Amino acid sequence: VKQDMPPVGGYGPIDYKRNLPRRGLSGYSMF
Amino acid sequence: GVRTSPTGEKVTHTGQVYDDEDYRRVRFVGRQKEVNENFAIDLIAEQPVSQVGSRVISCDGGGGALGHPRVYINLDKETKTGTCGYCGLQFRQQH
Amino acid sequence: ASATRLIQGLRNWASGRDLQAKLQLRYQEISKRTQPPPKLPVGPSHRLSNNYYCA
Amino acid sequence: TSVKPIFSRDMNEAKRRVRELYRAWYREVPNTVHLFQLDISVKQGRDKVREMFKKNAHVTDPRVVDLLVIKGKMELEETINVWKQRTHVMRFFHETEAPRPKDFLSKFYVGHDP
Amino acid sequence: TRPTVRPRNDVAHKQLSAFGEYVAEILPKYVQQVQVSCFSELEICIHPDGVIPVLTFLRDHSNAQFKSLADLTAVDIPTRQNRFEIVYNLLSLRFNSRIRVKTYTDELTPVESSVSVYKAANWYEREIWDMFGVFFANHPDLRRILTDYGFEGHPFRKDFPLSGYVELRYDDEVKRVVAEPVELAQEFRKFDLNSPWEAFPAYRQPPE
Amino acid sequence: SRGEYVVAKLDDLINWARRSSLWPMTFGLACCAVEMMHMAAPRYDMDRFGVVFRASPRQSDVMIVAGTLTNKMAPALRKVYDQMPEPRYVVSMGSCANGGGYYHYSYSVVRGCDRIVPVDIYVPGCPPTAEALLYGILQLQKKIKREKRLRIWYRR
Amino acid sequence: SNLTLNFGPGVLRLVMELSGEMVRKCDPHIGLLHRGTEKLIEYKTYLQALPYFDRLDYVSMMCNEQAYSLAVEKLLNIQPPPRAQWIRVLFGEITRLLNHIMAVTTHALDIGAMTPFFWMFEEREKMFEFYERVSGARMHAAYVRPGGVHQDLPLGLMDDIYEFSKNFSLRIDELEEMLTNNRIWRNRTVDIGVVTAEDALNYGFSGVMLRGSGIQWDLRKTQPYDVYDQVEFDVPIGSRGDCYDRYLCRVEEMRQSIRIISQCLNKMPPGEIKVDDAKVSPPKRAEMKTSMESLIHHFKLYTEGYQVPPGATYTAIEAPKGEFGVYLVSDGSSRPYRCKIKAPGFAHLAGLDKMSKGHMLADVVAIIGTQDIVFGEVDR
Amino acid sequence: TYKYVNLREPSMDMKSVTDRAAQTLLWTELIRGLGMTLSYLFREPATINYPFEKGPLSPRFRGEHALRRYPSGEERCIACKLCEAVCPAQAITIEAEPRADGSRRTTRYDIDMTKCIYCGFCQEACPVDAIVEGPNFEFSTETHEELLYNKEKLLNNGDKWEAEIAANIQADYLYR
Amino acid sequence: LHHAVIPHGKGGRSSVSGIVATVFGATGFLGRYLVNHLGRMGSQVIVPYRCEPYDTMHLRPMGDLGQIIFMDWNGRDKDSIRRAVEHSNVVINLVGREWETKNFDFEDVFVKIPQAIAQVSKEAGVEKFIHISHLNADIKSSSKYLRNKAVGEKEVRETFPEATIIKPADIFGREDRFLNYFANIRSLGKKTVKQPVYIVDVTKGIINAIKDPDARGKTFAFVGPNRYLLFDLVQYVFAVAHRPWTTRDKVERIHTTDRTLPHLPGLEDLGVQATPLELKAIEVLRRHRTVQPAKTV
Amino acid sequence: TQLITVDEKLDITTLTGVPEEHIKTRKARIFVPARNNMQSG
Amino acid sequence: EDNKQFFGRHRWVIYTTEMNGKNTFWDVDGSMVPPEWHRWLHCMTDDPPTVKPPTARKFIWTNHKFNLSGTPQQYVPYSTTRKKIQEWVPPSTPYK
């Protein structure tokens, strides 16, 4: 049989979390 | 196998044409009456009769599952060919 | 994908993310529009025996 | 034959509620002609109100006329508050509808309807 | 009967039967029937005088806590002299359960509004007024909610036709959308679909 | 003649301006509106055609009726149509706006918005795709392109 | 006296009683999309009634398909095959992504943030390509049917769903970069539309409208259907009952939908996609054209339809707008006797009047945004 | 099995209070949002060049209806009325009779494309693959009655689009 | 009588009235309400149009699907007239201009085009022909309008002897050029007596003239119920409209008194009650707002 | 008491919204439908 | 083709300037694409009809037509059935 299936090891990891990457200077440094 | 009425209107493969005194021809005035000129009754008469050596033949219309439901046609009458009720292909026992 | 590395670097800096690793425009990684034919399996009631419908 | 009432215990309380609903519609007709800027007169709208009340004048069941008063109050609430448009107010006046054949002979001429 | 047949849940069936006995014996003044379907849903068929006492019980009793009114529904069955079947679908989040409370009315008997039990009912029974004509007594603002403003009749009654009695069009003489008696260019084609052979012997009604 | 050429070029100019600056008012009635939102979405991007996203009704050039027109809303549709300045056009989008559709036999549904407003383009589908709606808008632009307002004015 | 504003004709009529800036009374007049769907259902077969459910919550098509299919399968006493159930959960969470993109981005568009609308509708266009590849239609698929699904997944579809899902969390991240920490977005949502838990239960709220108020309730967890007990996901719970926590709940539900979609792509089983009872689901076309029983069953299912045993169910799912229910009454025939459609937006828009008291007129469009209201399901 | 969105208590040391004061006074998250909008300014847009470029479709796509033929010119429709029985919109109107060679063929096959809901139940109910919902979606009209297709229009759509319809059916019939 | 033209239905939009009408001049003021009243019966209405098709859009909601057929025509082209009338069983002529243009004078609009339409309708076998003259049409009239319209009435009568000729006096309505002319003139008051007729009365009279077989060969005079002096009529118009493009031919026609023709039948002989101005002047003149009625004679 | 006595005939014609032409000119037929003689069921 | 372009841009048509007598230099139309190329352009397949030609049939149109709405060649609907009830024709001879 031939059917739409995932591959043998499965699919890779899928990111699903919040990634707000925390950029910028400190509050001390910005003043 | 399209033909034309004396009004100039084309007759469909059903046989529909409006009468001369019918007002509903006014819908084609300045426009066209769309007919299909490939009459299926004339095109299936163009197919040759399949000579087979069996008493009962099967027809599915070709293409397997792309055709029609597979039916079985008896060919015991030598006066008449055996016609498929779906596709109109006709068969004859060659003996 | 056709962006130059200066615009790519400016774009990654402005978003704060690596945008080329996860592009929202699709390219050759997607499936082919012409596929091989399927061979779909049949269910459990496709049996020639012990298959009475009242059961 | 012992049923639960809606508002009225008998027909006298029911006629009281009918009468108050008619008073409220009679007061509302000039304001309705004004703010919907209707092309009818106040006399014509009050005649339509009288026609709609006399259409239901044969009813002797207190629950049915209670529901008729309730539905008339709903129509009046939809009229006082501008929830109806001008089209809904003018649907009581079947103006674009051609007059139906009334006698036997014209109904015979136009078709099959009795 | 494993792969194609829905599996029966006997535990929930037994639990809902016990709770139906519980409700029927706490409230015998109003409970008329208690039944549990084969797919394990509990129906409490009550007298219409007990709309408020039963629903307040199921909302407030510590073994019921049916705090959510999922849906409120009427069903028109014209062969009954009380043709309208008022259906309450309740959800208890505490006991993870659903219950159905069913009662009845005809065209003229008012049902007591359950807005004092569930404020969710405020529009639903209002819809039951618009679609079926069931009047709800002591409702805060009972009026139409879904039909057009001057709409005559109650459309989800089964003697109300599919297309209505009137249809709208713009009339340019009066510069206005007008209502006229309905004429269809193509009539809705009624299909008689029912097989004359019995489908389910378990649901066979006893003959005359 | 000379004046016929001048009114032909002026017709071409005003038809160019009107078809390349179509501003739509979209009646977002039902599911078709969602597909109109895909015709404004970046893949199709109506704004690059000059077709702005969500013009106000008193400055719009075409009314897109995208969804089921019920009886309760048909006077509001007609009122917004009557408030549109000329030249106004109407695109009927989808089966319910075209002829009633899946709700054709309903007591509460207008059987096509052409009972209420004059319709220039009928876009078929349930819903028509955003590409099919964009096809209908470009067909409306072609219909505006062959308008003969000043030529008929010069011949009357 | 106080001002009365009639905000005329999705489409909604609103009757405001304002007292300056404040809202004293909000009366939503609806029925502008009442089409009499569930009277039309009574004159059609169960298969014929299915495409009406695509058109109720018309941003949540296959979820309403799933709810109606579960109701009919419950009354038929049959179950779908496992691959059909995994396809239903996969496309239900794709559908949940579709609806929460629509919800969040139009709720931001009505407040003034117009750009993440355009950013997320390209992802929404790719998911409509997934619908079109699996069914032939971008929106109203008519794909999830009683008995399973209509047709098996085409080859290569799951790889493309993987390629979408691998990148979609960055799209959520840049939506959340535009809105979540933005002080203008917080000023429009943080003290707006606060619902207590007891009032949300009493007013018939469901879904995020409960979960924003801290109520730990999700029907995929508590009353699970097809294979939702076999997938692992979290339920986002709000703390203040406002527009902002409901926004964050919808964003985190997009996160958890991506999580469920990854689990569905990895755990998709082989097998058939319709129930192998050919008195319910139509047989394959190759055996319809070969077998006598299959042709008879095809004929009768597409003309009469299957008879459903008599009885009434209330079948509910966790649709992306909340609890979507069908109260389906069968009389024994092949047509529904009654089909009441419970929509979440009906009770939510009924609660709009309590939610808008003490707020401004600009807050009302935010509250109509946080109640994810599609008037197709509100009006039927 | 559940998580708390927005249940973070902010830190009240002078470091975090100064961080929040710098975010308030120096507009840090607003510059973050401007950076994200600037990032999409330098991306290639998703806009395809319609009509020269087309949106991608599948061979399952449900577009304009067509009546098909066998590979002999004989039309496939044998007037069984399954498509109009299953039609959820009642968009299909069929009348039939035996024609001159006794074949069971339609004299009326009407599809009101403005009633039609484009759901394809007719093509899956069709036992002989006669009615199909083909690939055309660009068939908008200027008049309502141009979308009231009779049998001649549907057979001309079949003869017009058969080279594409047969190849789409060839790509998908093993899923059916 | 052919089977497709037998009347069916209850006289609504989807019904069949059995009227196949070619309405020349349907894009004007009278043609608007005539195509309205024909299309609500379920008549087949052929609209030959000269103008931009955009300017015919308002005629499209007036009937059921396929019940209004639009086609191009030219007044100096008998082939287009024959193309428009050869399937109809009634032809109505509503072609008119209040002013003469560069390409069409009053003789083209009122003599040449009506005689062409009537002759081509006669030789196409059209049963019924309705022509619209003016009440004040006279050979010795002071205005070129009324002179050419009397000449065109004479030629229509002599080339279609069974034509129904209709004489309206001064038609008022929402799109008229009688009350809207007086409300936007902001010419004077003289001894002119007028009895203006309402447009729905004229339309009901035309359609009753279609259905009445006794209206063939007749000449009807459609007048209002009340004769007014011109001065207090204009003052009533300025009173209702809340007030304190022209040519000298229009001035000659405003200062032409509406003649009394008792020998001709009117609206009452077609079963039409003539609506007075005071019931309908508010409906016309509500647009002009940013009342004691007029004295009759 | 909380119950009233209505001895009148039950008539809801003014409440059903049906126009009068489709009340007093219609003939309802009440019947058990005949068996389709094409079938024995 | 350009497979370096993203999916949606990677296939396009430059329409002809003249098709079926109509000047299409500026008036290009999406319905101008013949059906054998309509699979390829809408990405219903990977194979152009130069590589995988469509199956030849005697009834397939040799000349593709675009959308003919608004033209004299447009579709006009009509009932395709014949007259149901035959009327009695009276005799052409007198009755005396």
Ligand SMILES: CCCCCCCCCCCCCCCCCC(=O)OC[C@H](COP(=O)([O-])OCC[N+](C)(C)C)OC(=O)CCCCCCCCCCCCCCCCC
């Ligand atoms: C030539 C270029 C000119 C423009 C430059 C900037 C361009 C880019 C702008 C991008 C953003 C545009 C957004 C539009 C909407 C703006 C909304 C907004 O920000 O509202 C104002 C917001 C409002 O904040 P809020 O009200 O949202 O925050 C809550 C505040 N509490 C808790 C108090 C209620 O911020 C301000 O009011 C700040 C005003 C400007 C201050 C400038 C810095 C002064 C620093 C002085 C030194 C301090 C040192 C420490 C103390 C010791 C002193 C000795």
Ligand SMILES: CCCCCCCCCCCCCCCCCC(=O)OC[C@H](COP(=O)(O)OCCN)OC(=O)CCCCCCCCCCCCCCCCC
């Ligand atoms: C005696 C003779 C002169 C009589 C008076 C006329 C004076 C000159 C007026 C301008 C020129 C007249 C002709 C106008 C264009 C006519 C041809 C045309 O429409 O070509 C179409 C072509 C684009 O083709 P299209 O069909 O749109 O393609 C579909 C998209 N693929 O279109 C194009 O390629 C672009 C067309 C641009 C039109 C001209 C530019 C705008 C007008 C400028 C002058 C007027 C405005 C003045 C300033 C206004 C305020 C800024």
Ligand SMILES: NC(=O)C1=CN([C@@H]2O[C@H](COP(=O)(O)OP(=O)(O)OC[C@H]3O[C@@H](n4cnc5c(N)ncnc54)[C@H](OP(=O)(O)O)[C@@H]3O)[C@@H](O)[C@H]2O)C=CC1
């Ligand atoms: N007060 C009144 O209205 C009265 C009117 N009448 C007569 O009734 C008739 C209809 O009146 P009304 O509707 O008000 O007039 P309108 O001016 O409003 O309309 C006249 C119609 O004739 C068409 N037309 C005019 N000139 C020509 C031409 N040269 N070639 C082709 N078509 C042309 C116009 O088409 P287009 O839009 O293309 O220009 C329009 O459709 C006229 O004959 C008028 O004299 C009689 C008594 C009173």
Ligand code: SF4
């Ligand atoms: S035509 Fe279809 S998809 Fe479009 S709005 Fe109507 S029901 Fe929804």
Ligand code: SF4
């Ligand atoms: S696609 Fe659906 S609605 Fe359209 S004709 Fe086929 S069955 Fe009917």
Ligand code: SF4
């Ligand atoms: S289902 Fe197929 S064969 Fe049967 S009537 Fe319809 S198109 Fe013809």
Ligand SMILES: [Zn+2]
């Ligand atoms: Zn065969």
